[PDB]
């Protein structure tokens, strides 16, 4: 129950990392397209794990990472709902996006 | 079929799907029988099923999901279970065909009475 | 399309993959299109669906094959109506590997998922053949008609 | 690579045999799971023709 | 070599930071994570005490 | 544009990174504190009803 | 983490029945994870907690003494009105946070019950409807310039209506 | 930095704490979590 | 630099003013024709053909290649909607009346047939799916203290 | 509060006596120090509002405006540092002094309790603006623009003052929170109705409706960057703050004394958002956008709901910053060209590759792209208005759509076409103006992150 | 697209343009080049039939019936040429087609490299100012007071000296 | 066949007023040409004019802006259908929206006074 | 997948290839300056069809303004060269 959220946040962290690199000065030295393609590949390989755990448990998951505000009985927070739909759509989208990037 | 039989041919006898018990339930059965369930509320709850999912055909499905989880990576190991589950749903759809036909024949009877 | 042709001979790889995709979209029985499209075409006629809606839906299921074979003919079976010069190149890996991976996916993942996901809903497996095989029959019809017209 | 002009180019075997690979693979898989699931298009179940039932069952008054 | 270095610098380190975050800032709070209840079946025993459970009645045909 | 980017990144990092580092060292060594209930012989002060060390430090020195 | 506040119902975990001739991937996968990742993280956590304990610090919870209310408060005079209105704002904020707590516990119960939310997730909904009738009859139509005076007028009009109903 | 390390801005933390404690108290003692009447209707007096 | 003589003015009611206005706007008199006088503010700014800018000769290397307009060529009062990123009067092989007729006819036919099919739908010749426990009267909330209509389901 | 004011009253002699080569830098950096020190107000541990004397005070609804003003001062300075470059040192010193007087007045008023002090400061705001607009413009109609500005404002001012007198006499004092703890209810007759009018008419005339939006475009056009900044950012906000602080007494009148003003505000939002499509002058487009958003602010202010007030404050701050930024960008593209027209310069982004990303990041904040305080405010206000009636989502949506349209029209007629060939005067970006853009933006990021500061009274 | 057209036209060019348009629309209708050749020959015969005729009456009549038949039997979605209007490459590169004068504002730290090319810009601009004023008198001397001119531009009637108004044409970036 | 429209103008060729062979009309065309050529030449004597450190001024653009912005009220003369359209746009729609909102609010108010409208969960407003 | 650019020799050889495959009047021996209407007694139809064939051979389009005036293969080549900016 810790590997799951770990992966679900790691995929977003991977996709972030290049964007961050964009800010920096390495691009003029580095092959940004291959960098991003491979980061996406590893994001997909990560996203796969949720599929195995989900088909083996069929346990949906719901998370509230960060609490943004508290607006007088109507709060807000970065909430994820890793259920069948999204946990599968991530993998499909990455399987496509890796090829598209190449 | 019944569609045109209703729309361009005879216009009333063709029954209505949404009022089936409109006729008494034992107009031709001397002490008609009733149905049976082979899985209890507690089981069909703890197994976390859905409402368009849990019918009188639920035990086959429970055994199916057990055999599917167990040996998960060796999937395709639950096929004699799917066959039986589809068999039960076929049986149910046949029961419904038969109830519709029953109402059709009973309307035929009523109209024969006039 | 009006300025291309002979794509099969001049470029077999993309044409093979394009045919794969075209037939999958038509609804070929086991190419990851079937495993959703044909259950959908079951339910569409099996439930209390509005007549005109059902009808235009099946017409569209045919027009799928229609314009797919349109692509096929106008791009892959007629003559090379494109300019004389040629600098073809597809032996590059960054363009030959992705399509390969995507074809393997488009052939396997549909089946894999249809057999691995929890069975959300209760299907309906009791109907006549002329309602269980409607999509198949009508797509074959589209193939024949497109051939006749393109010729 | 070296272009041509109003002529057909000399092609390599890798790309063409990869295309043949993909297509033969599709045909193989189709035949395999057709063999294994010939009923997925027909169904193992028999749809009934009413007028074959009996007023005996589903009791009716005549 | 670069394969291993990339694996490290783009999977491992973030994994360490995120495991820290999760297991000591998120599961340390009332309803941050919600592990949907598992899908029990009949017969299935329990890694907790959970005495044996009963199967159903007749399975004709 | 290269000049603006580089100089802004400098004149930010310069004090952002030392500060963030001090913050990390504080959270590690000092860290947050406990919800010690109120004894019946002590009247806490404004620099003790707040959790974070930096917060209570400021509340003790300035405010 | 007051568990009496946040129930956290029990966890009827199932058991493993791996009946096949093939190995579970999750076994080795999670073993290797718990091996390589949790080890350093756990050691570092212990280090941090030890430094904490050696340079420990405490902090209390502010207890606001109570005071008279708007009722026992002569009009025109203010000091009393202020020392009452601010207490009332505190109470208002606390009630809002209570609402938040109820909603959080409710969403928890819902998800943790899954598809059976219509049967086992009905208890908390009753606490919700009750608490919400309360929060409505208290703080519904005040206005961004809300305050004890307007809340009291609300209460009083409602009491008068209920009493007229009772008497007829 | 100053802002981010400001404490309990307008009490949105002390209040959460206080609500937790009060809910514990009342859940135990059997009272309801929120009464539909705020001020004591006894000390109050009304016309006819 | 600009000046009143070079800027617009009032509605010229005399060819004396008209010709000077035209030579100012860099046009020719016999083509110059201002807007009517309803006092909406048009003043004396020429009235030009209500044509878009997708029409203009696209080959000539205009100076304003994004507007296909030359330097002093007077500017259509309503250019803001003819900037070529907007309304296009590019003539059509088909015509206005006939295209509108086609579209409306098609859409009317479609919606009419949809209503028709809703009034005379399709459905499979069977009854309604059954449900064991009073349509699961519990799992749909129900209550633990009420015995509503006993929904018994029979065999055929 | 003196800790915020006195130094701002020392920047003046500082400017006067400092040498030319150093006055700019000295005054700028020290104004930044003032901006920094202006954060002490954010130590609002508990709900007990801050009161420093019978003459000053702070609040959650005022503090944001205070900081925003103390931080827009130096941006005005900087953006006012390439033009008037051939104007004498004494003249530029006068300009600086006027800016600083504006800052000081705005702070004192956004802090003061007694609405009469608030009013004298609200009306002393003029002289520096009128001056800045007449003596440093670039066209001729600036005169008529200043006249309109001044006289609209004073016509508003008068009955406001008369009603403040009627109050000070009927009631004993004018101090706020005393007005609260001793307010009452009115017999709701024509007298009290005209009183409601004479109290809100000035604040409205300032925060423009459809009917009196006329002095805004003239100002923002004929006037320079600093006047445009300060108008679009604060001198409107003064009306909103006054209305918020004063409406506390006029209950219940504002239930039926609002329908005309709400109607006007919404219809004007719509018509002005439409004109923003076909308004050539860039600064005029920006001004009418400001009108379109302040109409939302007003519609949210009247009906008096907490969600509405918080949304008003959010959108207020957001629009202030975003409009200052857009005006910086306009000025920038003007100094190189000297023509406000939108369709003259086109097809940039090939020579100002970065600047675009300071153009883009503004539009997206205008059309309410989230996560932004802009959309948070628009959305909470739409919620309040939906509750107040179910037939206002219509207008909310029409406005959202027309905005999503003209923002991109503006992006695309200046940074999306193909480059002209006679604009040889395209001096590349200055680090100074890039800095101004970055400084207007970054705070949007930080506040999108932590907005609890920027909520309002109700939070 | 460099030379400019005359104000009026002639029957000749009108018929030519109708011919080219119809043949393109036929290439679009009838895809196969064999069918295209066939029907193009048919259209050529149709034209050569009335070719030798010269009566303006029959000319205008046939032309205005031909344009109507063309507009009524044209292709809805014709065959556009990519590099020309309507296509999928028109202006595609204008986002990269920068002009030269962006050069002057380079920084010396950048034009440090690329030194040779900047060693030749000067001798190019030097090839402009030294021969500009002359390019004016060539017109101000030949600015025929008749005052009826076209958009054409005369060459350098002298030798050695350069033509008039070559800047806005030379230095026009590539197409890429 | 084909008909004109305010959108799809009659294309160039089909226009009967084209194919005319009038000497006067052709002379007008050639005069337009003389004009346009003078303009383009005056423009090209500046596009390439060396020693230039500035841009070009488009007086047509300036005059267009003047006529859209500030030449309006002076040449404006009020008349009916104009005053009428103005009063319409300024009064009608406001009042329509107003009747709508007032009717809705009165409905809601009487409903609540009856004590019916389900307001459950309307805790924040 | 960009092929290499075009040069004058290639352009000339191609143009001769095409104008020789032409059959109407060309006596299979074209001088680079083999004027169509003057030096070969051709027709406007033929010239226009030549221009169209060249358009198809080189992908792009030649506008009428210059199609009507081209009367020399050397002129066609000069036009193509000044359009594609060849021979650095
Ligand atoms: C929240 C969730 C919403 C997500 C939706 C985001 C919408 C995306 C909008 C967008 O693309 O913005 C353009 C912007 C890039 O624009 P660009 O034109 O491609 O930049 C190229 C530069 O001109 C030239 O490149 P460069 O050398 O300047 O790159 C280094 C970088 C350097 O940036 C910095 O170092 C500044 C650090 C502060 O500077 C920038 O790229 C621009 C800053 O997107 C970004 O990469 C910025 C971060 C994106 C995250 C969201 C930022 C707020 C929006
Ligand atoms: C269920 C909902 C039912 C709604 C039914 C109506 C929906 C369709 C109306 C949508 C309006 C579309 C406007 C548009 O996109 O115009 C695009 C236009 C160019 O379009 P194009 O055909 O591609 O021409 C290219 C040639 N250069 O050029 C443009 O860029 C358009 C410029 C925009 C002008 C402002 C338009 C204001 C908004 C109009 C609202 C009216 C629609 C209301 C929908 C309700
Ligand atoms: C009044 C404002 C309008 C005026 C504009 C001019 C501004 C100039 C004045 C100085 C700059 C404004 C100060 C902004 C303060 C920034 C606050 C901040 O850093 O965010 C705090 C955030 C912690 O999150 P928080 O919202 O406090 O609590 C919820 C639980 N996470 O921690 C973070 O995550 C921050 C992220 C930083 C990266």
From Swiss-Prot, chain B:
It is a peripheral membrane protein. GO terms for molecular function: NADH dehydrogenase (ubiquinone) activity. A motif (Cx9C motif 2) lies at residues 78-88. GO terms for biological process: aerobic respiration; proton motive force-driven mitochondrial ATP synthesis. Keywords: Disulfide bond, Electron transport, Lipoprotein, Membrane, Mitochondrion, Mitochondrion inner membrane, Myristate, Phosphoprotein, Respiratory chain, Transport. Disulfide bonds join 57-88, 67-78. Complex I is composed of 45 different subunits. Belongs to the complex I NDUFB7 subunit family. Contains two C-X9-C motifs that are predicted to form a helix-coil-helix structure, permitting the formation of intramolecular disulfide bonds. This is NADH dehydrogenase [ubiquinone] 1 beta subcomplex subunit 7. It comes from Mus musculus (Mouse). The lineage of its organism: Eukaryota, Metazoa, Chordata, Craniata, Vertebrata.
UniProtKB/Swiss-Prot annotation, chain F:
Keywords: Electron transport, Membrane, Mitochondrion, Mitochondrion inner membrane, Respiratory chain, Transit peptide, Transmembrane, Transmembrane helix, Transport. It is found in: Mitochondrion inner membrane. GO terms for cellular component: mitochondrial inner membrane; mitochondrion; nucleoplasm; respiratory chain complex I. Coiled coil: none annotated. One of its GO terms (biological process) is aerobic respiration. Complex I is composed of 45 different subunits. Accessory subunit of the mitochondrial membrane respiratory chain NADH dehydrogenase (Complex I), that is believed not to be involved in catalysis. Complex I functions in the transfer of electrons from NADH to the respiratory chain. The immediate electron acceptor for the enzyme is believed to be ubiquinone. Belongs to the complex I NDUFB5 subunit family. This is NADH dehydrogenase [ubiquinone] 1 beta subcomplex subunit 5, mitochondrial. It comes from Mus musculus (Mouse). The lineage of its organism: Eukaryota, Metazoa, Chordata, Craniata, Vertebrata. The gene is Ndufb5.
From Swiss-Prot, chain G:
It holds the Pfam family NDUFB10. GO terms for biological process: aerobic respiration; proton motive force-driven mitochondrial ATP synthesis. It is a peripheral membrane protein. Residues 1-23 are annotated as: Disordered. GO terms for cellular component: mitochondrial inner membrane; mitochondrion; respiratory chain complex I. Keywords: Electron transport, Membrane, Mitochondrion, Mitochondrion inner membrane, Phosphoprotein, Respiratory chain, Transport. The modification Phosphoserine is found at residues 17, 147. Residues 1-6 have a biased composition (Basic and acidic residues). Its main location: mitochondrion. The keyword Thylakoid does not apply. Residues 7-17 have a biased composition (Pro residues). It is found in: Mitochondrion inner membrane. Accessory subunit that is involved in the functional assembly of the mitochondrial respiratory chain complex I. Complex I has an NADH dehydrogenase activity with ubiquinone as an immediate electron acceptor and mediates the transfer of electrons from NADH to the respiratory chain. Accessory subunit of the mitochondrial membrane respiratory chain NADH dehydrogenase (Complex I), that is believed not to be involved in catalysis. Complex I functions in the transfer of electrons from NADH to the respiratory chain. The immediate electron acceptor for the enzyme is believed to be ubiquinone. Complex I is composed of 45 different subunits. Interacts with CHCHD4. Belongs to the complex I NDUFB10 subunit family. This is NADH dehydrogenase [ubiquinone] 1 beta subcomplex subunit 10. It comes from Mus musculus. The lineage of its organism: Eukaryota, Metazoa, Chordata, Craniata, Vertebrata.
UniProtKB/Swiss-Prot annotation, chain J:
InterPro entries: NADH4_N, NADH_Q_OxRdtase_chainM/4, NADH_UbQ_OxRdtase, ND/Mrp_TM. It is a multi-pass membrane protein. Keywords: Electron transport, Membrane, Mitochondrion, Mitochondrion inner membrane, NAD, Respiratory chain, Translocase, Transmembrane, Transmembrane helix, Transport, Ubiquinone. GO terms for cellular component: mitochondrial inner membrane; mitochondrion; respiratory chain complex I. It comes from the Eukaryota. Pfam families: Oxidored_q5_N (PF01059), Proton_antipo_M (PF00361). GO terms for molecular function: NADH dehydrogenase (ubiquinone) activity. Its EC number is 7.1.1.2. The keyword Membrane applies. It is an enzyme of class 7 (translocase). Core subunit of the mitochondrial membrane respiratory chain NADH dehydrogenase (Complex I) which catalyzes electron transfer from NADH through the respiratory chain, using ubiquinone as an electron acceptor. Essential for the catalytic activity and assembly of complex I. Core subunit of respiratory chain NADH dehydrogenase (Complex I) which is composed of 45 different subunits. Belongs to the complex I subunit 4 family. This is NADH-ubiquinone oxidoreductase chain 4. It comes from Mus musculus (Mouse).
């Amino acid at each position: 129950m810790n590997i799951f959220t770990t992966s679900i946040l790691l995929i977003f962290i991977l996709l972030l990392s290049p964007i961050l690199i964009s800010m920096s000065n390495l691009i003029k030295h580095i092959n940004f397209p291959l960098y991003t393609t491979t980061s996406i590949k590893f994001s997909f390989i990560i996203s796969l794990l949720p599929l195995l755990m989900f088909f083996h448990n069929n346990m949906e998951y719901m998370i509230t990472t960060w609490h943004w505000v508290t607006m007088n009985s109507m709060e807000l927070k970065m909430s994820f709902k890793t259920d069948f739909f999204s946990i599968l759509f991530t993998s499909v989208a990455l399987f496509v996006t890796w090829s598209i990037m190449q | 079929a019944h569609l045109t039989r209703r729309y361009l041919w005879d216009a009333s006898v063709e029954p209505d799907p949404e009022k089936i018990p409109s006729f008494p339930p034992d107009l031709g059965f001397p002490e008609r029988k009733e149905r049976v369930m082979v899985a209890t509320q507690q089981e069909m709850m703890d197994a976390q099923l859905t409402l368009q999912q849990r019918d009188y055909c639920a035990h086959y499905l429970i055994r199916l999901l057990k055999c599917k989880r167990d040996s998960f990576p060796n999937f395709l190991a639950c096929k004699h279970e799917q066959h039986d589950w589809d068999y039960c749903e076929h049986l149910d759809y046949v029961k419904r065909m038969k109830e519709f036909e029953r109402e059709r024949r009973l309307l035929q009877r009523k109209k024969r009475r006039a | 399309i009006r300025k291309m042709g002979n794509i099969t001979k001049i470029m077999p790889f993309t044409s093979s993959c394009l045919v794969i995709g075209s037939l999958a979209l038509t609804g070929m029985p086991f190419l990851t299109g079937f495993y959703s499209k044909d259950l959908i075409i079951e339910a569409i006629n099996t439930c209390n669906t509005n007549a005109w809606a059902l009808l235009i839906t099946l017409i569209a299921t045919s027009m799928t094959a229609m314009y797919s074979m349109r692509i096929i003919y106008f791009v892959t079976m007629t003559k090379p109506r494109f300019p004389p010069l040629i600098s073809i190149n597809e032996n590059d890996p960054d363009l030959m590997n992705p399509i390969k991976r995507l074809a393997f996916g488009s052939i396997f993942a549909g089946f894999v998922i249809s057999y691995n996901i929890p069975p959300t809903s209760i299907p309906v497996l009791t109907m006549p053949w002329f309602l269980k095989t409607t999509a198949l029959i009508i797509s074959v019809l589209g193939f024949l008609i497109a051939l006749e017209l393109n010729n | 690579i070296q272009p041509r002009y109003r002529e057909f180019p000399q092609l390599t075997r890798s790309q063409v045999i990869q295309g043949e690979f993909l297509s033969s693979l599709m045909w193989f898989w189709i035949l395999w799971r057709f063999w294994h699931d010939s009923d997925a298009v027909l169904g193992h179940f028999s749809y009934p023709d009413p007028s074959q039932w009996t007023d005996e069952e589903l009791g009716i008054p005549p | 070599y670069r394969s291993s270095l990339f694996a490290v610098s783009h999977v491992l380190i973030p994994m360490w930071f995120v495991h820290y975050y999760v297991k000591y800032h998120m599961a340390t709070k009332p309803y941050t994570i919600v592990s949907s209840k598992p899908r029990i079946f009949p017969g299935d025993t329990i890694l907790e005490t959970g005495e044996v459970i009963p199967p159903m009645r007749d399975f004709p045909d | 544009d290269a000049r603006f980017l580089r100089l802004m990144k400098f004149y930010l990092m310069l004090t952002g990174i030392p500060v963030i580092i001090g913050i990390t060292l504080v959270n590690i060594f000092i860290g947050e504190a406990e919800l010690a209930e109120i004894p019946e012989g002590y009247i806490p002060e404004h620099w003790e009803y707040y959790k974070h060390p930096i917060s209570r430090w400021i509340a003790r020195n300035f405010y | 983490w007051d568990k009496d506040v946040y129930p956290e119902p029990p966890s009827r975990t199932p058991a493993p029945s791996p009946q096949t001739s093939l190995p579970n991937p999750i076994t080795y996968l999670t073993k290797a994870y718990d091996l390589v990742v949790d080890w350093p993280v756990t050691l570092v956590r212990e280090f941090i907690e030890r430094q904490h304990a050696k340079n420990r610090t405490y902090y209390y919870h502010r207890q606001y003494r109570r005071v008279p209310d708007i009722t026992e408060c002569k009009e025109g005079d203010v000091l009393c009105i202020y020392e009452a209105e601010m207490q009332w704002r505190r109470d208002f904020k606390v009630d809002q946070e209570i609402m938040n707590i109820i909603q959080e516990r409710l969403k928890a119960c819902q998800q943790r019950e899954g598809e059976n939310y219509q049967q086992n997730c009905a208890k908390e909904l009753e606490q919700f409807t009750k608490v919400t009738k309360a929060y409505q009859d208290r703080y519904l139509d005040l206005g961004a310039y809300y305050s004890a005076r307007k809340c009291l007028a609300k209460q009083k009009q409602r009491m008068l209506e209920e009493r007229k109903a009772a008497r007829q | 930095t100053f802002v981010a390390y400001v404490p309990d801005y307008r009490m949105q933390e002390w209040a959460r704490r206080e609500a937790e404690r009060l809910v514990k108290y009342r859940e135990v003692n059997g009272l309801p979590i929120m009464e539909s009447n705020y001020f004591d209707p006894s000390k109050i007096q009304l016309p006819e | 630099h600009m000046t009143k003589d070079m800027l617009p003015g009032s509605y010229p009611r005399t060819p004396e003013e008209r010709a000077a206005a035209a030579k100012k706007y860099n046009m020719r008199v016999e083509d110059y024709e201002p807007y009517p006088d309803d006092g909406m503010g048009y003043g004396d700014y020429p009235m030009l053909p209500n044509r878009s800018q997708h029409e203009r000769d696209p080959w000539y290397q205009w100076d304003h290649s994004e507007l296909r307009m030359n330097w002093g060529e007077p500017i259509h009062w309503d250019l803001d909607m003819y900037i070529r990123n907007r309304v296009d009067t590019s003539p059509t092989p088909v015509s206005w009346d006939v295209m509108c007729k086609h579209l409306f006819g098609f859409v009317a036919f479609m919606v009419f047939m949809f209503w028709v099919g809703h009034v005379f739908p399709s459905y499979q010749p069977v009854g309604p799916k059954q449900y064991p426990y009073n349509n699961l009267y519990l799992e749909r909330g129900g209550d633990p203290t009420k015995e509503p209509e006993p929904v018994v389901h029979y065999d055929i | 509060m003196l800790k915020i004011i006195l130094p701002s009253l020392m920047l003046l002699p500082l400017t006067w006596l400092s040498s030319p080569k150093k006055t700019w830098t000295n005054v700028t950096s020290y104004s930044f120090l003032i901006s920094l020190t202006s954060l002490t107000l954010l130590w609002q541990t508990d709900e007990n509002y801050k009161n420093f004397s019978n003459m000053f005070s702070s609040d959650p609804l005022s503090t944001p405006l205070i900081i925003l003003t103390a931080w827009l001062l130096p941006l005005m300075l900087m953006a006012s540092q390439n033009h008037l470059k051939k104007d004498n040192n004494v003249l530029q010193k006068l300009y600086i002094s006027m800016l600083i007087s504006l800052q000081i007045l705005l702070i004192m008023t956004f802090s003061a309790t007694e609405l009469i002090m608030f009013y004298i400061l609200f009306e002393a705001t003029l002289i520096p603006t009128l001056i800045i607009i007449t003596r440093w413009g670039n066209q001729t109609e600036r005169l008529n623009a200043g006249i309109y500005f001044l006289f609209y404002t004073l016509i508003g001012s008068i009955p406001l003052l008369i009603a403040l007198i009627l109050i000070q006499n009927h009631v004993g004092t004018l101090n706020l929170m005393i007005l609260s703890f001793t307010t009452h209810t009115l017999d709701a007759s024509w007298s009290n109705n005209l009183l409601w009018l004479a109290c809100m008419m000035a604040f409205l005339i300032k925060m423009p409706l459809y009917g009196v939006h006329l002095w805004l475009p003239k100002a923002h056009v004929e006037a320079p960057i600093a006047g445009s900044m300060i108008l679009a950012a604060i001198l409107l906000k003064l009306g909103s703050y006054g209305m918020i602080r004063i409406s506390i007494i006029l209950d219940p009148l504002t239930k039926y004394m609002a329908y005309p003003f709400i109607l006007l505000s919404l219809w004007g939002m719509i018509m002005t958002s439409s004109i923003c499509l076909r308004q050539t002058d860039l600064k005029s487009l920006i001004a009418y956008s400001s009108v379109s958003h302040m109409a939302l602010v007003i519609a949210s202010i009247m009906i008096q709901t907490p969600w509405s007030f918080m949304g008003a404050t959010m959108l207020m701050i957001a629009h202030g910053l975003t409009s200052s930024l857009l005006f910086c960008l306009a000025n920038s593209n003007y100094e190189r060209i000297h023509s406000r027209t939108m369709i003259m310069a086109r097809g940039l982004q090939m020579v100002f590759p970065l600047m675009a990303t300071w153009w883009l990041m503004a539009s997206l904040a205008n059309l309410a792209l989230p996560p932004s305080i802009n959309l948070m405010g628009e959305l909470f206000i739409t919620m309040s208005l939906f509750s107040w009636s179910n037939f206002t989502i219509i207008l909310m949506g029409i406005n959202i759509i027309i905005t999503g349209m003209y923002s991109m029209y503006m992006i695309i007629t200046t940074q999306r076409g193909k480059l002209t060939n006679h604009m040889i005067n395209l001096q590349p970006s200055h680090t100074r103006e890039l800095t101004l853009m970055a400084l207007h933006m970054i705070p949007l990021i930080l506040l999108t992150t932590s907005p609890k500061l920027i909520t309002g009274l109700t939070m | 697209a460099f030379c400019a057209p005359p104000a009026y036209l002639t029957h000749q060019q009108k018929v030519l343009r109708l011919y080219k348009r119809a043949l393109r629309h036929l290439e679009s209708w009838c895809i196969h080049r064999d069918k295209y050749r066939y029907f193009a020959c048919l259209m050529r015969a149709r034209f050569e039939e009335h070719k030798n005729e010269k009566d303006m009456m029959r000319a205008t009549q046939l032309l205005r019936e031909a344009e109507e038949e063309f507009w009524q039997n044209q292709h809805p979605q014709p065959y556009i040429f990519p590099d020309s209007p309507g296509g999928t490459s028109f202006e595609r590169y204008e986002c990269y087609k920068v002009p030269e004068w962006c050069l002057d504002y380079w920084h010396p730290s950048e034009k440090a490299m690329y030194p040779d090319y900047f060693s030749k810009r000067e001798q190019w601009k030097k090839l402009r100012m030294e021969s500009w004023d002359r390019e004016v008198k060539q017109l101000q001397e030949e600015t025929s007071p008749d005052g009826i001119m076209t958009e054409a531009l005369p060459p350098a009637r002298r030798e050695g000296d350069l033509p008039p108004l070559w800047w806005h044409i030379v230095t026009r970036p590539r197409e890429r | 066949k084909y008909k004109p429209a305010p959108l799809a103008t009659l294309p160039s060729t089909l226009d009967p007023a084209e194919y005319d062979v009038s000497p006067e009309t052709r002379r007008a065309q050639v005069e337009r040409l003389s004009i346009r050529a003078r303009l383009k030449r005056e423009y090209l004597l500046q596009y390439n004019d060396p020693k230039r450190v500035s841009h070009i001024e488009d007086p047509a653009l300036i005059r267009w802006t003047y006529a859209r912005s500030a030449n309006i009220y002076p040449n404006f003369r009020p008349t009916p259908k104009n005053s009428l359209l103005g009063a319409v746009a300024g009064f009608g729609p406001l009042i329509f929206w107003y009747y709508v909102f007032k009717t809705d609010r009165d409905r809601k108010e009487r409903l609540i006074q009856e004590g019916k409208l389900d307001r459950k969960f309307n805790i924040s407003y | 997948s960009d092929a290499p650019p075009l040069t004058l020799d290639g352009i000339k050889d191609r143009v001769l290839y095409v104008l020789k495959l032409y059959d109407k009047i060309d006596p299979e021996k074209l001088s680079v300056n083999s004027h169509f209407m003057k030096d070969l007694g051709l027709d406007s139809l033929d010239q226009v069809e030549i221009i169209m064939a060249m358009e198809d051979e080189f992908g792009f389009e030649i506008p009428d303004i210059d199609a009507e005036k081209l009367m020399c293969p050397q002129e066609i080549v000069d036009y193509i060269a000044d359009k594609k900016d060849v021979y650095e």
